Amino acid sequence: MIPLQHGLILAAILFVLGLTGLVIRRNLLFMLIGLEIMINASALAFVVAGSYWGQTDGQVMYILAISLAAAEASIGLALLLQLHRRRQNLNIDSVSEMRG
Amino acid sequence: MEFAFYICGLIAILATLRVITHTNPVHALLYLIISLLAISGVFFSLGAYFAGALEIIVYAGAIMVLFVFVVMMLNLSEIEQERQWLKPQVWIGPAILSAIMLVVIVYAILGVNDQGIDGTPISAKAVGITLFGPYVLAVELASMLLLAGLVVAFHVGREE
Amino acid sequence: STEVIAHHWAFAIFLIVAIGLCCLMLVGGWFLGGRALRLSAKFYLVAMFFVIFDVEALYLFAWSTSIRESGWVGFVEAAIFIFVLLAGLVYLVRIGALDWTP
Amino acid sequence: MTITPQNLIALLPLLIVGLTVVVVMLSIAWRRNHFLNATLSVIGLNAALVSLWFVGQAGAMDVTPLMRVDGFAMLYTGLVLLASLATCTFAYPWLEGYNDNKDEFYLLVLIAALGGILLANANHLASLFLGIELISLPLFGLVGYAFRQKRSLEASIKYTILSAAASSFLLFGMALVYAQSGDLSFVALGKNLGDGMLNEPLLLAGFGLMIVGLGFKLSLVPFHLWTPDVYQGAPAPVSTFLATASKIAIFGVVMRLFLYAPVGDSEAIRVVLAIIAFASIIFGNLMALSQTNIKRLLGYSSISHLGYLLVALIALQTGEMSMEAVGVYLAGYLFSSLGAFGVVSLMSSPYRGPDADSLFSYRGLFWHRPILAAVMTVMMLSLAGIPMTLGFIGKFYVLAVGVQAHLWWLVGAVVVGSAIGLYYYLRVAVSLYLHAPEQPSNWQYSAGGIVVLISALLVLVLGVWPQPLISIVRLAMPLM
Amino acid sequence: GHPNLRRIMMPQTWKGHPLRKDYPARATEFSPFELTKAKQDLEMEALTFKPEEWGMKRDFMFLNLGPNHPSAHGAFRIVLQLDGEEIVDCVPDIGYHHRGAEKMGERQSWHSYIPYTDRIEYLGGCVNEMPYVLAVEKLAGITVPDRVNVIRVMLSELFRINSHLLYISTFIQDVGAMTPVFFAFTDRQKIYDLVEAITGFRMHPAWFRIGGVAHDLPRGWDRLLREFLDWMPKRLASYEKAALQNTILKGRSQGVAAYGAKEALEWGTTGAGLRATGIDFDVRKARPYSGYENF
Amino acid sequence: WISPELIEILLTILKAVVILLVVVTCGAFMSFGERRLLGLFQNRYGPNRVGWGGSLQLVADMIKMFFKEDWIPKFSDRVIFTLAPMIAFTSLLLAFAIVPVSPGWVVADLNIGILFFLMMAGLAVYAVLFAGWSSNNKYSLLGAMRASAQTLSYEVFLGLSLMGVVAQAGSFNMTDIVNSQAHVWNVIPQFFGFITFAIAGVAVCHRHPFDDGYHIEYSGMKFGLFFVGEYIGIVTISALMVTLFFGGWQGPLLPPFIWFALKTAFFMMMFILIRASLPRPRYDQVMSFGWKICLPLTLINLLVTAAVILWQAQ
Ligand SMILES: CCCCCCCCCCCCCCCCCC(=O)OC[C@H](COP(=O)(O)OCCN)OC(=O)CCCCCCCCCCCCCCCCC
Ligand SMILES: CCCCCCCCCCCCCCCCCC(=O)OC[C@H](COP(=O)(O)OCCN)OC(=O)CCCCCCCCCCCCCCCCC
Ligand SMILES: CCCCCCCCCCCCCCCCCCCC
């Protein structure tokens, strides 16, 4: 008696909020934060879908989603550390040299 | 169980909205931790007990710990002195685009058959049964994915 | 059931009273009483290792509660998982990733 | 379900590449030896390639509720393994000039090849997602392997951010698809729909988000803007792997998804894929008109060739020879891209420091590197679809498949894009054979030269005599 | 040719040279202005730190350990140059505990300066009184009798045991074990009972005189000495087996700040460090004094 | 309004409130008890002049910390500064919220249990980090990153040390865990799990010998919240290892709550003796011991436990 539509709507709201944070912020740290928000929203959507059908598949896909999320957070934060080490700023618009 | 789900969803939405509009990185990470706790409450309201447990243990206990560690490393610096994302000429366009995509996805959601989520609690025993049953290779190649992330992050995140 | 809703109310009251106790303690502390550098990347490395091995730990958490229902083939699968985990740990130790000292 | 010993026999390349990952891991843990670790990696990849024969003698059936092993999976596993072996061969002389740790490169290549094998054998949304991540994250490491270099770090940041965004889009798409259908297997996507109600709104939305993620992964317009930057900034063997193996594996799993899912026959998805293929062909050819750099030109080339592949994929439900066309085209594209990116890698090896430019300067290459120039112009003629080359055979297959399914807009797109490709590819060839103002000695460099030479010989021989390739592709027939 | 000829006892903003004969020895009138100025200097010291006036050179962090230190050896400041955890360079800021004892030597009589000699190092007491009174007896032409030598050796060895118990306890507490300092302070209380009985004071007895000691030994001191001699060895064995044989303590201690005989000789290092470098040079044996040859 | 369902609701609520008050009072009373027992170990008395036996020393300390001038640093983040002792208290309090002290006396009979304890540890690390960052001091920040790196190095195998007990019980529930020890307590089969969980529990509580301090800017009643939070963490870890490795409330003769209280008291006294006895290892030695010895020990223990269980399965 909790609708699947409401859970999917909540996950979609969090996904588009994470996408908005990923786009509008020039800071690479806030871009990684937005990426974490989007992948957590997708994992929440999988949990909602699995709970609607009464299957463990949603939680299995949640586990795979957070394994991916942890690994990409590690890789992105290492890249952010290298960028801050060799540029002393996190402005992602500064790294735009290759073009055309 | 309905009330807990809706209040946790509302808290997660408000906390994410405060995350993507804040200036202080530690404050943004704190509202992100609050949003992760709220989404874990959503998971617990839907009977996904293992998913909410992992949401606090791993997502809100390891990943955002790593984010907080890196933010303390940076000692965050030409960020609050700009505030460019709150000027409308930067954020109106992407907000319009995200609103359009949200409208399209919500319209697609509203045209589905719904029998309602009964919220029957799915334990971690069943998740472990199906994890080492139908999804053996998922576990093994996810170990390899974590290994790949470990090797990549060690190779990049050094100092020499 | 009545027992499960009693336990739910007990847990809710526990959480609320604990939050109220610490908040009232801080409020009473505030109210009463008159008035008058660049870190080394080993921190990121150890936190990253904790994150990765905590995800591997979550996989083992899921395995451990259903060992009997998985049988011996589940033991073989988890042994392969643990062997890959230990190979990664040996790899990390041997290249000095886990050596805080230089 | 349970796993039989026959299932383990059918999973032989997966187990062999994973055991190679573990063995190379423990060998690096023992002692950092570049030659020994590279040798162990190529030995494991060759062992998987020759265990494909035992997989063929095993049969074609369902190893997991997640994997299905058939001749399609064998062919795509072979292409991925060949691309990974060529990546290691080009990578050794480039890594010989690398001053930091070299051994992690082959570990990342092995894990990416494991993800490619996963995508080749994938029969499940979970397997598709895990294979995409298992490909992408070693590519995150490899694209920014020379992270001290500014362009490589920039390409790594761009690829990591955009691929995490595409993974989130794809994951949300599978979440909506699972919410609709209730099963994550490929055969059960839209199976519960009936009476002409195949165009379910939530199922179409989930498939659209998955199309967004996969079209990022396949460099399709308008998720294509990352491709020339990431191709240019990455190391040249990494660009070889990213152009060949990732594209091949992701297109193979997309082919499986659209072949097995009953919603793959939807008219709306077909029209959306037609628009994406048209825009991809035209845009990828148009952006490469004025490209001086060879890496960006090859990135736009990858966009156009994936558009031709998408054109072949649209006619999957109409003609039964669409899988034949995709296999022949992918073999030809693999060999041509291997030759071109191997010429780039051999002229970019050894790595001459992070603070120096990695410009190619292909002008006047024949007067000091004649065999490399001959191979490179053979590859440029092959990518143009000019006869006597295997790329022409693939483009002929694409045109035949488009004609059989009456995709006339796509046929005109292929013709126009082929003309534009003729312009810039012949420009590269004559620039090779012009004169230059100004401007090895080990057996691994010679091995890379041998690899690009056999690639050129295969392109020419199978351009004038394609029937063995046709027969081996017809042997790679999946489950019905 | 000195590298950094800067002041080491007085602050850098000090006028005059205190050990000169025309320098006034007594304390100047206190002023809150100078205290406020020096507080402001201490506040802006971290803001305007220049690592060139301190004798240093050149990701290199700079840190200050002191000036206040939560330990029993005093309060002094160390400026540390750090590469991560590694120490690249370090200079000590000393002179924070400068009492002007030599200038007081120029201001007291020969007899009334003995209490000042007590407070040179305050764990030693009569050990600190001994070289001063022996030098004054050299100036006076005094050959003290044998009982004087034996009494002074007694008190010097008692205070040596007191100081060594303090040192071992402080080292163990710095490693991290917290109980042996309590037990060895009980042992120090036993020593202080004997010293209080003999001299009348605990840690600054000022009991040595030019030509002897202030009083005779009180009747009954041998009972207290026998009690302490029966008390000590079991407690010392307990300290060894409880903390000094602990492998964690050995890991924290062994191989830490090692040097050979050449470094000990070139730096003037004497005492336990010089003898730990293998050089058998003790004053009580090489150049005997106060009848130490009879023990 | 007199109905037996409402009577049972109020009885369970009253039992939970009683458990909460008893565990908080126990944490404070053995702050004073640590002072007294350190005096006992160090051949002295400790505080025994404020009331009978010193029992009113805690009340005097409570009043003194209440009426101390409340001081927040001027250039600090006020919300994070207030939030760090908040978490350091409530995290391990809610960790205690799943401990069964008697048959029928449990606040939350959750299906997750030690998973909830792991969540609470993953918030205690936030408490330490927030205390370090909010102080606006670089020495406190460096000390906090070192302490949080240590607690991550031991939190990485806390759960895997508990997984042997979980595997033997076959469930995450704490009552199932204490019912699976009906014949033999889990300390006998899961001995390596016992030593690894004891080491990890001492380390994640930042107790001796696993302790530029990050509490120097904290004063008034916030320092008291930190103190009682650490002591509540000691009580929680002791009760958890009593329930997980030592049967919990199971005993032959004495009543079950008496057995639980005696075992918990022995383990808390073992904490006091551990502080009084061992010296501090170096930081690199501590992390190398956590990463190179204890984590493989937990993994091998889990493998051996699974092999033993599947051998016994007919
Ligand atoms: C810029 C260069 C590139 C130019 C664009 C690329 C080529 C575009 C070709 C456009 C073709 C338009 C066809 C329009 C009708 C389609 C629907 C139809 O009615 O088809 C009839 C028929 C299918 O029906 P069926 O029952 O099979 O009848 C058998 C007929 N004997 O159909 C068939 O049986 C097959 C019909 C095939 C028609 C010929 C296709 C190729 C013709 C040569 C190239 C185009 C014309 C020359 C160039 C124009 C200017 C560039
Ligand atoms: C709720 C109640 C809980 C109460 C507490 C109960 C459990 C207490 C757990 C305490 C854990 C302390 C762990 C300390 C680990 C130190 C590891 C280490 O690196 O030690 C350094 C030392 C030398 O190592 P090395 O590498 O040789 O260094 C030389 C370099 N110069 O290496 C060594 O000396 C090697 C040995 C290290 C320590 C091994 C484990 C000792 C555990 C403590 C004693 C437990 C006694 C029994 C307790 C009761 C049991 C019922
Ligand atoms: C210095 C360079 C900065 C580049 C910033 C790029 C920001 C792009 C924002 C795009 C906003 C689009 C708004 C909606 C457009 C209409 C709807 C989509 C097309 C139908």
Ligand SMILES: CCCCCCCCCCCCCCCCCCCC
């Ligand atoms: C049509 C398929 C491909 C056929 C072969 C294409 C060419 C391959 C290279 C052959 C050797 C080229 C030698 C060119 C010499 C030019 C000398 C110019 C002198 C001014």
Ligand SMILES: CCCCCCCCCCCCCCCCCCCC
């Ligand atoms: C350190 C111990 C903390 C314990 C917290 C919970 C206390 C609960 C007290 C319950 C008392 C009654 C138990 C059931 C009856 C059996 C025992 C009767 C004699 C006390």
